[PDB]
Design a protein around this nucleic acid. Structure first.
Ligand SMILES: [K+]
Ligand SMILES: [K+]
Ligand SMILES: [K+]
Ligand SMILES: [K+]
Ligand SMILES: [K+]
Ligand SMILES: [K+]
Ligand SMILES: [K+]
Ligand SMILES: [K+]
Ligand SMILES: [K+]
Ligand SMILES: [K+]
Ligand SMILES: [K+]
Ligand SMILES: [K+]
Ligand SMILES: [K+]
Ligand SMILES: [K+]
Ligand SMILES: [K+]
Ligand SMILES: [K+]
Ligand SMILES: [K+]
Ligand SMILES: [K+]
Ligand SMILES: [K+]
Ligand SMILES: [K+]
Ligand SMILES: [K+]
Ligand SMILES: [K+]
Ligand SMILES: [K+]
Ligand SMILES: [K+]
Ligand SMILES: [K+]
Ligand SMILES: [K+]
Ligand SMILES: [K+]
Ligand SMILES: [Mg+2]
Ligand SMILES: [Mg+2]
Ligand SMILES: [Mg+2]
Ligand SMILES: [Mg+2]
Ligand SMILES: [Mg+2]
Ligand SMILES: [Mg+2]
Ligand SMILES: [Mg+2]
Ligand SMILES: [Mg+2]
Ligand SMILES: [Mg+2]
Ligand SMILES: [Mg+2]
Ligand SMILES: [Mg+2]
Ligand SMILES: [Mg+2]
Ligand SMILES: [Mg+2]
Ligand SMILES: [Mg+2]
Ligand SMILES: [Mg+2]
Ligand SMILES: [Mg+2]
Ligand SMILES: [Mg+2]
Ligand SMILES: [Mg+2]
Ligand SMILES: [Mg+2]
Ligand SMILES: [Mg+2]
Ligand SMILES: [Mg+2]
Ligand SMILES: [Mg+2]
Ligand SMILES: [Mg+2]
Ligand SMILES: [Mg+2]
Ligand SMILES: [Mg+2]
Ligand SMILES: [Mg+2]
Ligand SMILES: [Mg+2]
Ligand SMILES: [Mg+2]
Ligand SMILES: [Mg+2]
Ligand SMILES: [Mg+2]
Ligand SMILES: [Mg+2]
Ligand SMILES: [Mg+2]
Ligand SMILES: [Mg+2]
Ligand SMILES: [Mg+2]
Ligand SMILES: [Mg+2]
Ligand SMILES: [Mg+2]
Ligand SMILES: [Mg+2]
Ligand SMILES: [Mg+2]
Ligand SMILES: [Mg+2]
Ligand SMILES: [Mg+2]
Ligand SMILES: [Mg+2]
Ligand SMILES: [Mg+2]
Ligand SMILES: [Mg+2]
Ligand SMILES: [Mg+2]
Ligand SMILES: [Mg+2]
Ligand SMILES: [Mg+2]
Ligand SMILES: [Mg+2]
Ligand SMILES: [Mg+2]
Ligand SMILES: [Mg+2]
Ligand SMILES: [Mg+2]
Ligand SMILES: [Mg+2]
Ligand SMILES: [Mg+2]
Ligand SMILES: [Mg+2]
Ligand SMILES: [Mg+2]
Ligand SMILES: [Mg+2]
Ligand SMILES: [Mg+2]
Ligand SMILES: [Mg+2]
Ligand SMILES: [Mg+2]
Ligand SMILES: [Mg+2]
Ligand SMILES: [Mg+2]
Ligand SMILES: [Mg+2]
Ligand SMILES: [Mg+2]
Ligand SMILES: [Mg+2]
Ligand SMILES: [Mg+2]
Ligand SMILES: [Mg+2]
Ligand SMILES: [Mg+2]
Ligand SMILES: [Mg+2]
Ligand SMILES: [Zn+2]
Lengths: 104, 83, 124, 138, 208, 99
RNA sequence: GGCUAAUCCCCCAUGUGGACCCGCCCCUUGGGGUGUGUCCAAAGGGCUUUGCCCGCUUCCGGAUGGGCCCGCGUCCCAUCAGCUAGUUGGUGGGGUAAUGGCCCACCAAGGCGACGACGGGUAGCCGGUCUGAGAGGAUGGCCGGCCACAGGGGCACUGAGACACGGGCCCCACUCCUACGGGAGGCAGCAGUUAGGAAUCUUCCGCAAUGGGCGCAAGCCUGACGGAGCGACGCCGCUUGGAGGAAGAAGCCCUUCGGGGUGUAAACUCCUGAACCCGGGACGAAACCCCCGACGAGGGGACUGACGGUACCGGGGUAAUAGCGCCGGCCAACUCCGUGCCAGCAGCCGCGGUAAUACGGAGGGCGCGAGCGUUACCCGGAUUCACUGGGCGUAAAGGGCGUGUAGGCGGCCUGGGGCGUCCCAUGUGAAAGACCACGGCUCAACCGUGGGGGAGCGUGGGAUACGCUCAGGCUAGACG
């Protein structure tokens, strides 16, 4: 069945497209500990209906573009930037770990 | 087209075929679609030929084309006997 | 380390390094003898051991021990080498196979003959 | 705070028994109490009871031991020879019924936590369920 | 290859009596009956406390040297025994005992195992009618091991089978001295066999 | 010193020229139609559109276009023509365009 | 340049139907229906010739095969940390069987990265295989599946299908032909040659069988395949003899010079009788086809064997290959002579400088046997990368200290949810292999039939203790 995923909209600076961050949890194959890895999906939002901070369902779809095979199925829960926050920061720390400038 | 034929399985001088449904283009001992019997040309045992005639009839009903030898074997097991 | 740590860095597998760059892993390599000297063993021992600098097809040049009572390896002998160092002569890590190519077998050998390329003593 | 209250308890007990204490108090939690019941029923402790140390709820855990002994060191054998935490914050361990262990060819027990409540490796095997392997005791 | 050579020296090294000759092994000429000490220039010297290894080695070498089987074949049987269900030691002895060349010896068609081997290779034996000349052929419970009809008139088979008139046969077998045939009733139980061997040590030798 | 199957190469070349030509026609008329429609010439543009439609379906009779390739072309054609017309309007000869 | 046939190409017609545009209905991404308009069909051949066969056209469906897309999984280096402009997305096109920046205009300014982007190294992936108690480690040869390539690079044509190993075009490198303008070619098919290498076979037989292409069929093609050949390369089976033979030949080796060992071993005696010589001699092969019947069901008859005069059965019949490593400890097996830190041995510890069980030989002995050793490489032992299953005061190992980001982890009670977790059913998990059983070659290797498993993933249903999440509460942590 068309895979359905739930996630948070972390970007919407694109036309009719939003970025959804989907987390997942599983037992490390050798160390057991439940670890939590995640991935971002560019989902189709033709009505520009979804905004930053929405937790949405996403459904496997027919290609809309390269790098874009999912459509926003529906809104699960509105606004909640606490999630958008983790992301933004986790990305900001990247500056402070190379050779140039950054923030601690 | 798809066929019903014999795939070789025994060993040197010890042939044992498998009556099989497969695409005509596949190598003979390659991936078949279904096994519907087996055949020992040297009748080394009382059970040298078995054919799932209900199944044979199915494939035959969908286009499967038997080899002249496969047909010969299927007949022997009353695949075409309409009596 | 903590499990979180093993999850973050994991264990590191041990890479085993060779003692026989007879290249291609190959069981044997062919070469030609450059020099055919003699060497002095280390500390505990003393004697005149027969070595041989060899230029391998492997595209290598290394010293290889010449086992047995007596040989016949000049400055252009075609030799076949195998793995096997000589604990006394640091730097010698291969043996010449007495019985192949130019390195003749040992004569009047009667025990461990196969290890010295000496055919079964004729006669009855 | 304690990072693992069940391990804290398993140890308070491990410790108390090594110096043959009478009882031992542990901060109370339903889950902890639930584990004691198995502990009691299988005859590892004499039982326990809710009490109020100071102003907060605890659980006197009446320990139990064998008889005095012969020769040097008369100290009695332990009822709880071994009591170890298996699942832990940082590394939770879950098992399927087909994967439930067998502590000392049966002479010991494993305490799982299932959706059918806290059970021993048999109560679990019986009800045909598995869950979080909490600890083993023998 | 099946060895082929001085057999009594094997008795001398194992210190026990193996019957690689049938008669003579019951006679005051048995060598074991007059030189129970190992062969070679040191047979009479003071034996040194054997090593745990030596003990196991010697013990297995004894059991194998009894059936005249190759270390190769021998090892394969043991592995097969180890795989099968049941006490490996016994199952091992059952299999070793199910070898036609051995069964032919048990039924007294031959004086020794090495003789029963030749009687098989040369067709003088039969299994359920059809002839078999494979010393290693495995007799199963219910089979009938007989002498080849064309062979029933052999000076050697005459003697051997005559001498059988009167002798008893293993509880797992059953001879018929008249018709020159017998039957493998069932796999011999450990108790039935009385070999000077501790199969336990053997299983350990292959455990190393 | 070789295979008489060089024949397939000869045949291919004729078949190639045969296809190339059928298509050139299709394109040329297709444009012609789109152009007339764009200029408001309805009766004229539809008239030509039908040839195009016909040539396309015909090309599909054999292995020139075959498939849904014709379908695709007819579609894109009738759409561009119907739309270009509607920007002045009045589909006279009511050629291929359905009511 | 000229002539000409067709199942070659084209035009008109017929419209079951189908395609396209627009509308309406159901359905929900471009699925199904309906209406008007437009557009689109075809090929003949053979006869036992007027009734069948082979074939043609359009459409719906089946079956097989395949394209594209998505989740998760898939080595080493962070002494590679920033990467990106068709780049990321949008609108409109083009292109295709089809989605898509696949391609193109135009607009936006995005996309990716420590959960390792980008870069560098290495590498076809898998079923499986080897090893291991397992977890795991290593591996991907044969066989089966998928992918990629066909001298190197690029490209399209034809076609249901190709960007085509024995098709085409261009560039490049090479070989050959050349009357110097210009042409020809590609064994990573079978066999073979040459080069490289430690090392890898026959320019064999057959199309009898299984399979494939074309043909109504007869039949043709098939280095696919079925066989044979070479190589102990591996596995399995088998032989070089069996029984009797001296308080024990000779020779050889030790010796307390009494004697001890090789050893029932030999010679001998009797028995069987591998090799070899005769006779017989196969399964694999019954279909296609023909006749009857209806070209069906059914019945009947005929042809056909490379392997091969091989397997195997019967008769006769000789007593007739044994080697290799090792014997100081680990490690099973000891003495003499020779040599004198020499000649040499050596896996580690070590051995030899005058009486060496360690060097060399001999006698004897242990091991294994058509093999035995050696080298190389993988797993093991090695809980020595420790998940199972390790450690850091002095053995290697605590960061010089703090502050703190991400992350990891989280006290007590109640409730909702049910992501983790657990349960049931179900689908999937090809065949081969592996396991068990029975069975076919005299056994076995090998092979056939059958059975039993299986983690993971999809779907439906269920549980809610623990973890997570949401909501509320508490004061024992923390803070004031
Ligand atoms: K950045
Ligand atoms: K069908
Ligand atoms: K054409
Ligand atoms: K012409
Ligand atoms: K119409
Ligand atoms: K169809
Ligand atoms: K299909
Ligand atoms: K499909
Ligand atoms: K587009
Ligand atoms: K384990
Ligand atoms: K692996
Ligand atoms: K791999
Ligand atoms: K693997
Ligand atoms: K045909
Ligand atoms: K018929
Ligand atoms: K014969
Ligand atoms: K002889
Ligand atoms: K001397
Ligand atoms: K000395
Ligand atoms: K010595
Ligand atoms: K020596
Ligand atoms: K290792
Ligand atoms: K330090
Ligand atoms: K520092
Ligand atoms: K709840
Ligand atoms: K395995
Ligand atoms: K499932
Ligand atoms: Mg937006
Ligand atoms: Mg995901
Ligand atoms: Mg020295
Ligand atoms: Mg070495
Ligand atoms: Mg030596
Ligand atoms: Mg067993
Ligand atoms: Mg072991
Ligand atoms: Mg042609
Ligand atoms: Mg033009
Ligand atoms: Mg002309
Ligand atoms: Mg119509
Ligand atoms: Mg419609
Ligand atoms: Mg309509
Ligand atoms: Mg009209
Ligand atoms: Mg028409
Ligand atoms: Mg006609
Ligand atoms: Mg588009
Ligand atoms: Mg399109
Ligand atoms: Mg692009
Ligand atoms: Mg940027
Ligand atoms: Mg490569
Ligand atoms: Mg291990
Ligand atoms: Mg295993
Ligand atoms: Mg494994
Ligand atoms: Mg393969
Ligand atoms: Mg090439
Ligand atoms: Mg075609
Ligand atoms: Mg085409
Ligand atoms: Mg081609
Ligand atoms: Mg290709
Ligand atoms: Mg070629
Ligand atoms: Mg060469
Ligand atoms: Mg053929
Ligand atoms: Mg054929
Ligand atoms: Mg003598
Ligand atoms: Mg004898
Ligand atoms: Mg005879
Ligand atoms: Mg005779
Ligand atoms: Mg034929
Ligand atoms: Mg006729
Ligand atoms: Mg007729
Ligand atoms: Mg018939
Ligand atoms: Mg020893
Ligand atoms: Mg001297
Ligand atoms: Mg000297
Ligand atoms: Mg000396
Ligand atoms: Mg000694
Ligand atoms: Mg030694
Ligand atoms: Mg390990
Ligand atoms: Mg650990
Ligand atoms: Mg350590
Ligand atoms: Mg230190
Ligand atoms: Mg410090
Ligand atoms: Mg801090
Ligand atoms: Mg924090
Ligand atoms: Mg908590
Ligand atoms: Mg948290
Ligand atoms: Mg759930
Ligand atoms: Mg399942
Ligand atoms: Mg399978
Ligand atoms: Mg059998
Ligand atoms: Mg099977
Ligand atoms: Mg399961
Ligand atoms: Mg479910
Ligand atoms: Mg609930
Ligand atoms: Mg809750
Ligand atoms: Mg709260
Ligand atoms: Zn004896």
């Amino acid at each position: 069945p068309k895979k359905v995923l739930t996630g948070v909209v972390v970007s919407d600076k694109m036309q009719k497209t939003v970025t959804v961050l989907v987390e997942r949890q599983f037992p490390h194959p050798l160390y057991g500990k439940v670890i939590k890895r995640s991935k971002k999906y560019l989902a189709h939002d033709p009505e520009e209906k979804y905004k930053l901070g929405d937790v949405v369902e996403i459904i496997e779809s027919r290609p809309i573009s390269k790098r874009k095979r999912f459509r926003v199925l529906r809104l699960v829960e509105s606004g909640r930037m606490d999630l958008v926050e983790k992301y933004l920061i986790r990305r900001q720390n990247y500056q402070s770990l190379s050779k140039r400038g950054g923030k601690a | 087209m798809v066929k019903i034929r014999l795939a070789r399985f025994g060993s040197k001088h010890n042939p044992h075929y498998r009556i099989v449904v497969t695409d005509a283009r596949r190598k003979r001992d390659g991936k078949y679609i279904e096994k519907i019997g087996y055949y020992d040309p040297r009748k080394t045992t009382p059970d040298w030929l078995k054919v799932d005639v209900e199944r044979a009839r199915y494939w035959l009903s969908v286009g499967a084309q038997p080899t002249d030898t496969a047909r010969r074997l299927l007949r022997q097991a009353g695949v075409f006997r309409q009596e | 380390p903590t499990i979180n740590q093993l999850v973050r860095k994991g264990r590191e597998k041990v890479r085993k390094k060779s003692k026989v760059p007879a290249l291609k892993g190959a069981p044997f390599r062919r070469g030609v003898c450059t020099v055919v000297r003699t060497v002095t063993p280390k500390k505990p021992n003393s004697a005149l051991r027969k070595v041989a600098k060899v230029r391998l097809t492997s595209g290598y040049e290394v010293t290889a021990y010449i086992p047995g009572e007596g040989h016949n390896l000049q400055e252009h002998s075609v030799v076949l080498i195998r793995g096997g160092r000589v604990k006394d002569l640091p730097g010698v890590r291969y043996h010449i196979v007495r019985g192949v190519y130019d390195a003749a077998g040992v004569k009047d050998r009667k025990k461990s003959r196969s290890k010295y390329g000496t055919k079964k003593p004729k006669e009855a | 705070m304690l990072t693992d209250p069940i391990a804290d308890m398993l140890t308070r007990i491990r410790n108390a028994t090594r110096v043959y204490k009478e009882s031992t108090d542990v901060p109370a939690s339903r889950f902890k109490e639930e584990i004691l019941r198995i502990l009691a029923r299988e005859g590892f402790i004499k039982g326990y009871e809710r009490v109020d140390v100071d102003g907060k709820p605890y659980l006197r855990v009446y320990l139990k031991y064998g008889p005095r002994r012969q020769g040097p060191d008369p100290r009695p054998e332990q009822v709880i020879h071994h009591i170890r935490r298996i699942s832990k914050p940082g590394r939770r361990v879950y098992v399927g019924v087909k994967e439930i262990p067998r502590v000392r060819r049966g002479l010991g027990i494993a305490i799982l936590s299932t959706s059918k409540g806290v059970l021993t490796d048999r109560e679990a095997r019986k009800l045909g369920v598995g869950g979080e392997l909490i600890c083993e005791v023998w | 290859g099946r060895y082929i050579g001085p057999v009594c020296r094997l008795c001398r090294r194992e210190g026990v009596k193996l019957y690689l000759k049938g008669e003579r092994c019951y006679s005051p000429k048995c060598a074991m009956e007059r030189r129970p000490y190992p062969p070679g220039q040191h047979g009479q010297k003071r034996a040194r406390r054997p090593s745990d290894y030596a003990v196991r080695l010697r013990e297995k070498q004894k059991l194998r040297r009894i059936y005249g089987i190759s270390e190769r074949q021998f090892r394969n049987l043991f592995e097969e025994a180890s795989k099968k269900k049941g006490v490996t030691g016994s199952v091992f002895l059952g299999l070793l005992e199910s070898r036609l060349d051995n069964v032919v010896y048990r039924l007294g068609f031959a004086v020794s195992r090495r003789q029963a081997r030749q009687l098989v290779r040369h067709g003088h034996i039969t299994v359920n009618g059809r002839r078999v000349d494979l010393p290693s052929y495995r007799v199963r419970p219910g089979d009938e091991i007989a002498v080849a009809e064309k062979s029933r008139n052999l000076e050697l088979i005459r003697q051997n089978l005559e001498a059988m008139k009167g002798r008893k046969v293993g509880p797992w077998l059953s001879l018929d001295v008249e018709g020159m045939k017998g039957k493998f009733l069932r796999l011999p139980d450990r108790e039935d066999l009385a070999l000077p061997v501790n199969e336990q040590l053997v299983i350990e030798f292959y455990s190393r | 010193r070789n295979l008489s199957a060089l024949k397939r190469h000869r045949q291919s070349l004729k078949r190639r020229l045969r296809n190339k030509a059928k298509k050139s026609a299709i394109k040329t008329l297709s444009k012609k139609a789109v152009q007339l429609a764009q200029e408001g010439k309805a009766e004229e543009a539809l008239k030509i559109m039908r040839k195009a439609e016909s040539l396309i379906d015909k090309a599909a009779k054999g292995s020139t276009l075959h498939k849904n390739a014709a379908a695709r072309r007819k579609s894109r054609l009738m759409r561009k023509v119907r739309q270009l017309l509607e920007a002045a309007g009045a589909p006279l000869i009511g050629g291929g365009l359905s009511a």
